[PDB]
Design a protein around this ligand. Structure first.
Ligand SMILES: *C\C=C(C)/C=C/C=C(C)/C=C/C1=C(C)CCCC1(C)C
Length: 232
């Protein structure tokens, strides 16, 4: 019965794998030249971001990143490999914006640590047997997400507006893309296999695939095609 997997969403997973891989090879066979030590950081960060995602999408495709969790009434398919991906790649995406706005080490740590909680709490939620409690973890997770998005929006903007026109402009486009795509993740989870079965794992997988590529390759293509602070 149980929210069928290991087979339907294979195309979505495979397609995720393809885009993340090509996006990685792209950022690689583009960062060939690049002298500027500042620009060097952005290329490095933004190339690991989809490389993590490639590794993890492969595992889901090949089955390894799938597991079964007892909840609600049945044997529920869960892709923990998402959370393995998200754990590292999401802090890196924050580090891109931090570096771009030259944010204080204080905020950076507060940020990365908070992101740690947000995804880790997701990881606990996703695997919690007791149905009712999954939403306790979701609430904590989305609160931690909201905090991050707050400092990005109401914080990092002001600091950005004081940099260079290019920096303020570039940060803003990213900030927009970030706040939006981020806000979708807890909604997809809430309505998906993970939470309330409004939407099947099949669509949950597809939504997350489109969101993940957008939030990584799409994100990276805004960044690595602009003036990356002093550098290019
Ligand atoms: C793939 C790259 C990005 C930017 C991923 C972002 C992921 C999130 C903001 C995930 C948030 C979650 C929440 C708030 C609650 C359910 C569990 C999630 C981990 C999906």
């Amino acid at each position: 019965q149980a929210q069928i997997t290991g087979r339907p969403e294979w195309i979505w997973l495979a397609l995720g794998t393809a885009l993340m891989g090509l996006g990685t090879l792209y950022f690689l066979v583009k960062g060939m030249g690049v002298s500027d030590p500042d620009a060097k950081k952005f290329y490095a960060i933004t190339t690991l971001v989809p490389a993590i995602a490639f590794t993890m999408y492969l595992s889901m495709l090949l089955g390894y990143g799938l597991t079964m969790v007892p909840f609600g009434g049945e044997q529920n398919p869960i892709y923990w490999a998402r959370y393995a991906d998200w754990l590292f790649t999401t802090p890196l995406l924050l580090l891109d914006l931090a570096l771009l706005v030259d944010a204080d080490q204080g905020t950076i740590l507060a940020l990365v640590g908070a992101d740690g909680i947000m995804i880790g709490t997701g990881l606990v939620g996703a695997l919690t047997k007791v149905y009712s409690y999954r939403f306790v973890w979701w609430a904590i997770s989305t609160a931690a997400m909201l905090y991050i998005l707050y400092v990005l929006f109401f914080g990092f903007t002001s600091k950005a507006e004081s940099m260079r026109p290019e920096v303020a402009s570039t940060f803003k486009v990213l900030r927009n893309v970030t706040v939006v795509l981020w806000s979708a993740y807890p909604v997809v989870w809430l309505i998906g296999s993970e939470g309330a079965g409004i939407v099947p794992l099949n669509i949950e997988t597809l939504l997350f695939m489109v969101l993940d590529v957008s939030a990584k390759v799409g994100f990276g293509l805004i960044l690595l095609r602009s003036r990356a602070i002093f550098g290019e």
